[PDB]
RNA sequence: GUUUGACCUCAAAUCAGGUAGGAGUACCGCUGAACUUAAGCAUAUCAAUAAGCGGAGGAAAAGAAACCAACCGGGAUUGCCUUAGUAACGGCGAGUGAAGCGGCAAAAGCUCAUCUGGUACCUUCGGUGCCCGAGAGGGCACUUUGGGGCCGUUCCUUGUCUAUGUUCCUUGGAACAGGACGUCAUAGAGGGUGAGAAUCCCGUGUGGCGAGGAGUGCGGUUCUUUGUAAAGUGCCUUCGAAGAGUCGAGUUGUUUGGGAAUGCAGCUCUAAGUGGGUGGUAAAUUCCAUCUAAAGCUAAAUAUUGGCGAGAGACCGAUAGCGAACAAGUACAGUGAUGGAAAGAUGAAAAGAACUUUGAAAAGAGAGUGAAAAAGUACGU
RNA sequence: CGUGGAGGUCGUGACGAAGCCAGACGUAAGGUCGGGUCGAACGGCCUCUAGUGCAGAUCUUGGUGGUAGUAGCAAAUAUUCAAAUGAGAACUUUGAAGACUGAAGUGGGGAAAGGUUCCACGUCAACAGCAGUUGGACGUGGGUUAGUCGAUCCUAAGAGAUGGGGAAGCUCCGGGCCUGAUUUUAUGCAGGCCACCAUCGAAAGGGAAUCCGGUUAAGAUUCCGGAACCUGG
């Protein structure tokens, strides 16, 4: 009976919570104490092109997170992944995976397919981003590939 | 006559009493999954045809 | 063997004469007793049993169906046709019927749903 | 899970509750075995029901290698049996090895008239 | 004085036609408790609860104002929201406990006060052919003035397809490992498979494609009757279809937040007819402000400790979760109502222990199978 | 500090969890590893949540020790002795010899009830408070034959269908029969009577008729061989 189990958020909090949690993708130290590998840069968001919603497969952005050496990022997530104790093995629960790149775009229409392949990938838009997007497991400082119209809308 | 003659309940009783037999050799062997003890076994002195 | 399709181009006097031969092979099965045996021929032919008497019952149904589509009929029809109480609640019918005249017209009218249609 | 949408299945709990006690069909999904490469060109498909002309090799087993007709399949508790993929009890009696279908690869089928109208129609 | 044929009222039969009784889990209308609370108790509370009874549907039930009101405006009815622990009740103790509004879900206004049966005919929710029984007004300028069929699409059902490694070495009984090499992904959800698999298989995927169906509305096409009367706009008077043991009263109840002022029952008594009712005690007036009971219908939105199908999950994981993971409401107890358990697991493969010695038989010995028999049958640990 | 689960982070794994002995500490909650078992999964950290830690509650349930090889297997005194058979014999069976039962502390035949226990055969794990070749265990077949027995029929103490009336309601009290034209097929037109009305209720009230013996492994006044009789229409 009865437990509420619905906590309630403010808006000052979450606003709060969201925007030092993009932040957080800006300076480096956090984003390596949070359990990323990162190198190339480590300046860090990644900018990319408007271009990137025209992304059709997945051969394309395997490549792409080359280029930004952020391939390794991607090789993190591809091995390393536990075979969790317990029910959750009943329901679906059987491998949890580590979460690597976020994409976010810029486009009304939906995420870029494509980039949502990768293993340990999220894709989202801003419109629809969250705190768990920048920080999942609430430890900020995930990699990022923001597009520039992206980056426009998140001001 | 007698006993208890009633043609209806005697049909019962007999019925149940071949409905009350041991098993054939061949579902233990063809077999679903069951250490196949009946159960439905109904006994000489002890319980009773059913009240 | 027996095929539903052979039946049915069989005549009313033909399947006749099969349910006759069908009882006395089923018959000829009883006195093979003494073995065990004998039934793979039975329990087909219970399934023949069944066939030739529906077989019959359809043909039946389809001939009373047309010499009475002519004419008035109908409670074992009407059995079909509803399939029981609600079914039958659920009709009269009940639909065109309560609308069939009264304030709509008035209401109203087109030359104006067509006008505007493109 | 995936293609999460409004629809029927996803999902572990029945998936195994469903493909194991199985209706006569979901033992059809799982009639089907992998091909071999000629017939995977011709027929245009990854894997078919196998039949019991055919002719199927063995992958998995230490049966492995092996190739005979197929006797039957037991649709029930799905498994196929093998010509000459047998056995050996102690009285020195041969009696059939039960084999799952994905173990097996279908070396030659027998194309048949419905089936090969449904083949052509995979294709 | 007396009968006979015929008219209508009541009755009984009869066969026909038409429908109901019963049922499914809960949801959904009445009659009506208690322990319990107030640390007692009797009003109050529990509670208009539970129960019992009646009965309907896929939702039900309610509905276009004799409303709201405390102003000046709203404008049918549910539900949701909150009004508010406010008003109000009450040993004014304990407790009890709204509405109007505001705005949402969703919207819709109308309708009362020739029909049927028989037989015939057809393309049988119909009509024709026959026979039989039973909001209103005047005259003028006009403008507005139909349905049916067909196909496709709308929504439901169903089937089919359909990416990419099964490579090397090593270990192993087995690679689904490591290292090495390589591939797809619009499919890195999940399952199976001799081990820990995107690429073996199922599937999977923003997935595509084919068929079948009631019912409707959008679009396209196609048939065809006259008309008449309705309706708008404007002039003229005018006005009924507007519901009685009702409205209202007392005296007796019970119910409610309802308090002189909730709603309902009972007994008694009892109006008017554009007159009447309401506006939170009762009584003059003009008038204000609102509305016409004693009648009815009605889509949609809400419920469903769920019959029927499916998903989901920091749920549980075999003394837990249902009573029930299997033969479970089984086995079994009780005269009956009713009560009610324990109950899963060999192995990659049955390869599920030949043959022999010994024995009454049960069994043991050796031996065989397997990576493993202290893996040998209620057999994982 | 420790627990099950979630997510993220750090990883770990075909010899993991789990187990028991030990080995190292942390006062301590616990902790870590090893033997040698086991043959698939598990930690840490951060953050969280909760079917979150037991000796106990005449606590729940299961299992187990002592109590014990202990009480009971004792009042009809009933067997004994050859022998049959069997792998096995105090209790199965044969004989002999002996008692006991006696309106039935053990005859005959049935009513209720049981529900196949009957009969045959073959087993002995389980049962019979012990053996057990035996049995009524178990398993596997088989057996019950009705015009004349009895139910059916009747009506009885009343279950009471059954106006009307309370109660929403559940619930509860208080014409039918016989024909005549035809015609012998029963079609068919037409006429005439009469009181308090149904069914059920006793397998032991009352009541239409059957005995003699013969046969079966197991039926019998049923079947049969003879003989008889009844009931209806």
Same mark, same amino acid.
């Given at each position: ?83 969790? $104790? @317990?029910? @959750? ?10 979460? @690597? ?53 998140? &001001? | ?19 009350? /037999? ?16 009946? $159960?439905? /076994?109904?006994?000489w002195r002890r319980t009773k045809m059913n009240i | 063997g027996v095929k539903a399709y052979e039946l049915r181009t069989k005549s009313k006097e033909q399947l006749a004469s099969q349910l006759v031969d069908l009882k006395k092979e089923l018959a000829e099965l009883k006195v093979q007793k003494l073995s065990r045996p004998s039934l793979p021929k039975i329990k087909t032919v219970r399934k023949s049993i069944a066939c030739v008497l529906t077989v019959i019952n359809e043909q039946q149904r389809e001939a009373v169906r047309q010499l009475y589509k002519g004419k008035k009929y109908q409670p074992k029809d009407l059995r079909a046709k509803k399939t029981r109480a609600l079914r039958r609640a659920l009709t009269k ?26 | ?50 039949? /019991? &002309? ?10 492995? @290698? ?58």
């Open positions: 009976t009865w437990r509420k189990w619905n906590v309630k958020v403010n808006h000052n909090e979450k606003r709060y919570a969201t925007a030092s949690a993009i932040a957080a993708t800006a300076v480096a130290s956090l984003v390596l104490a949070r359990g990323h590998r990162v190198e190339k840069i480590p300046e860090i968001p990644l900018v990319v092109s408007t271009d990137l919603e025209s992304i059709q497969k997945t051969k394309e952005a395997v490549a792409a997170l080359k280029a930004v050496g952020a391939h390794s990022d991607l090789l993190k997530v591809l091995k390393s992944k536990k075979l969790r $104790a @317990g029910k @959750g093995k009943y329901r679906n629960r059987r491998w949890t995976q580590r979460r @690597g790149p976020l994409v976010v775009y810029a486009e009304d229409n939906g995420i870029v397919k494509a980039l949502r392949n990768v293993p340990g990938v999220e894709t989202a838009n801003v419109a629809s981003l969250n705190l768990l997007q920048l920080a999942p497991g609430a430890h900020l400082g995930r990699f990022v590939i923001w597009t520039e119209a992206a980056f426009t809308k998140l &001001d | 006559m007698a006993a208890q003659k009633s043609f209806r309940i005697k049909q019962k009783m007999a019925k149940a009493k071949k409905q009350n /037999r041991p098993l054939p050799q061949w579902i233990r062997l063809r077999t679903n999954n069951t250490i196949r003890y009946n $159960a439905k /076994r109904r006994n | 019918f009940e639909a065109s019927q309560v609308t069939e005249k009264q304030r709509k017209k008035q209401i109203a009218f087109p030359q104006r749903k067509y006008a505007i249609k493109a | 899970m995936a293609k999460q949408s409004l629809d029927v299945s996803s999902d572990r709990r029945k998936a195994r509750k469903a493909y194991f006690t199985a209706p006569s069909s979901q033992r059809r999904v799982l009639l089907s075995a992998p091909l071999s490469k000629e017939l995977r060109a011709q027929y245009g498909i990854k894997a078919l029901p196998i039949r /019991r &002309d055919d002719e199927v090799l063995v992958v998995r087993g230490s049966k492995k @290698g092996q190739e005979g007709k197929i006797s039957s399949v037991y649709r029930l508790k799905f498994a196929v049996q093998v010509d000459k993929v047998t056995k050996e009890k102690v009285n020195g009696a041969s009696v059939p090895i039960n084999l799952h279908p994905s173990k097996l690869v279908i070396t030659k089928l027998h194309l048949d008239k419905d089936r090969k109208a449904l083949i052509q129609r995979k294709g």
